[PDB]
């Protein structure tokens, strides 16, 4: 069973988006009005599931094949998972979901007029390697309109979920594409107060990783909370 041997650097709640960000309408009623209660880390918080023995399918991470070929821009999304100390996070669970080339999600509630793609599902998962590397093969998602302001459009994005070594490190986020003119207009993106933090969410075109005459590549590294041994406790 797991053991309490680690401490995780405290989260900077001024770095991460706040709970109440009124331009993002839904946050109004879904944000707490009372202050969060701080508690010391115990084994409850410093441990988490290990997915090494989960039975991954052969194309769990290849969205081009896991659902004919999907229509859209063929891309590889790769990067590494490291902690705040710059240490790789091996055998960690990386999950992702997204819309198709038109901005359509394969979900009951998605009524957007852009058509579904009969060869695309939009879900992948990958366990990072010994060096903290992950990769997926998919198609570039399209932006889509949503009921916020009368003319709001989400920039093209991929949703990501990362496990890390504990429940203290677990994170849900979104990757944006370098140069997307929609980024600075987004109320969700704007939930993040510091511009420098926004930069962390933008995948960079990575020509070095592309497959000539086949597909482009984007690089997206993720930083989880720094893990340290306990001392003089």
């Amino acid at each position: 069973p797991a053991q309490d041997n680690s401490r995780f650097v405290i989260r900077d709640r001024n770095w991460h988006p706040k709970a109440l960000t009124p331009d993002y309408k839904t946050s109004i009623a879904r944000s707490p009005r009372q202050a969060l209660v701080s508690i010391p880390q115990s084994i409850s918080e410093t441990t988490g599931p290990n997915f090494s023995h989960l039975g991954f399918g052969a194309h769990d991470h290849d969205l081009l094949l896991n659902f004919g070929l999907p229509i859209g821009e063929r891309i590889i999304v790769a990067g590494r998972v490291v902690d705040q100390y710059g240490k790789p996070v091996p055998n960690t669970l990386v999950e992702m979901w997204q819309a198709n080339a038109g901005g359509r999600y394969r979900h009951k509630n998605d009524r957007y007029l852009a058509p579904l793609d009969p060869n695309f599902g939009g879900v992948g998962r990958c366990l990072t390697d010994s060096d903290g590397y992950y990769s997926f093969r998919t198609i570039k998602p399209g932006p889509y309109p949503w009921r916020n302001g009368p003319n709001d459009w989400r920039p093209a994005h991929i949703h990501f979920g990362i496990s890390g070594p504990s429940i203290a490190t677990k994170l849900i986020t979104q990757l944006y594409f370098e140069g997307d003119p929609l980024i600075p207009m987004c109320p969700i993106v704007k939930s993040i107060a510091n511009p420098e933090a926004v930069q962390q969410l933008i995948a960079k075109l990575d020509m070095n990783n592309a497959n000539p005459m086949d597909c482009l590549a984007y690089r997206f590294d993720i930083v989880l909370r720094g893990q340290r041994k306990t001392h003089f406790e």
Binding site: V9, H16, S27, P40, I43, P49, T173, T230
Partner: protein, 200 residues
């Protein structure tokens, strides 16, 4: 001061979180192996219980697109980190609220007692993480049981909550479902009876 690399910023799970993390719930074909709401198999040691609840917004309206992650010790107060569908008990699970009823359920066992860093025992509890559209960064809570009043009174975690009235927000109410021991745990994100959320 010393500055490390900044952590990647959180973002809301959004309304389609199910396609990615709750396949069955999104009503899409699932894969061979999925992380779902059954932490224990019939032959797992301990007292088998059913957990259910609803999630409310600041308007007292049901949040029907919520996603929840749970982490708990097994009946021996042990944390089973090696996740495997072959296991009789998994300490980790996932659940979500119905687009209709908007109620989540979990099948597990009552968690054993675990000690805090200082060697002090914490009352039986389940660690919860709440995700959904409208929530920029996930909310952390704990589920305690009403039938553990003695332990609950001495919990070093429960005790950090200044106001006694707020502690109540964390106690699940014991019931029965089809003659099965059940505990109801409702979450109120905002307002009157707002549930206590932690930072760690």
């Amino acid at each position: 001061p010393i500055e490390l690399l900044p952590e990647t910023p959180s973002q809301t799970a959004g309304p389609y979180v199910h396609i990615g993390l709750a396949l069955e719930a999104a009503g899409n074909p699932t894969r061979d192996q999925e992380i779902w709401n059954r932490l224990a198999k019939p032959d797992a040691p301990g007292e088998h219980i059913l957990l259910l609840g609803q999630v409310y917004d600041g308007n007292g309206h049901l949040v029907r697109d919520s996603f929840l992650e749970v982490w708990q010790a097994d009946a021996n107060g042990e944390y089973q980190d090696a996740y495997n569908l072959e296991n009789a008990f998994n300490s980790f699970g996932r659940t979500a609220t119905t687009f209709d009823a908007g109620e989540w359920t979990l099948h597990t066992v009552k968690p054993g007692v675990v000690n805090n860093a200082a060697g002090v025992p914490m009352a039986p509890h389940i660690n919860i993480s709440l995700f959904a559209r409208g929530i920029n960064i996930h909310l952390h809570t704990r589920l305690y049981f009403d039938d553990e009043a003695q332990a609950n009174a001495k919990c070093p975690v429960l005790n950090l909550i200044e106001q006694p009235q707020r502690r109540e927000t964390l106690i699940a109410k014991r019931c029965e479902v089809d003659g099965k021991t059940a505990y109801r745990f409702d979450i109120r994100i905002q307002g009157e009876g707002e549930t206590v959320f932690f930072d760690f």
